[PDB]
Amino acid sequence: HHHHHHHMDITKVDTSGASEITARQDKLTLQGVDASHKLAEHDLVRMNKYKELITRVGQKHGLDPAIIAGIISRESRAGSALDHGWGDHGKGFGLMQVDKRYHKIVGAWDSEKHISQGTEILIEFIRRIQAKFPVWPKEHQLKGGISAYNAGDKNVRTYERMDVGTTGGDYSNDVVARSQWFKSQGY
């Protein structure tokens, strides 16, 4: 079960950005990729507090820090959406919303240890999609892995419609677009 995500490049992944449902969280009139970019921008000042940690975690895991930032923006609005680190049902923990029912949580909610745990979980989902669909373009495997972070690898059943069944019907599309935006902010 070797890992092999070292060729993946977030800049090559196609995206249609946020759905209307997702855009409404900031009452945006923007749509799609534009909306994702604005959602990300709204989280930038908070994200920048964590940028040094996010960068270190990405480097330590061979993953683009911008992807980690995209996940954090989507999962927790860089902490703004959380109550002492917890999601609304006390199950999701931390900037990346690790599910305490699936994992033994580690670190404070805003810690490097936490960000490493969420990042490892994402990296494992990427590995699984590479295993499940070994002939796919790596861009599609990366996008599918991101979708699986929200919906599980079991939700990735076909090449088409990957974000069907994800929260908002747009999880990987939105995360990819936010990640690209953070990359252009120097993540």
Q: Which residues bind Cl ion (CB under 5 A)?
A: 87, 89, 91-92
- Residues 6+ away with beta carbon under 8 Å from 47: 54, 69, 72, 73, 78, 182
**DSSP 8-state secondary structure symbol assigned to residue 16:** -
CA-closest candidate to residue 71, choices 178, 185, 186, 183: 178
**Rounded CA gap, 175 and 91, in Å?**
21
Beta bridge partners of 92: 99
Identify the active-site residue in 14, 34, 64, 75.
Answer: 75
Whose CB is nearest to Cl ion?
A: 87
Q: Cα 138 to chain center, whole Å?
A: 17
| Residue among 66 and 98 whose Cβ is closer to Cl ion | 98
75 assigned to active site: yes
88 assigned to active site: yes
**Rounded CA gap, 125 and 117, in Å?**
13
Catalytic residues: 75, 88
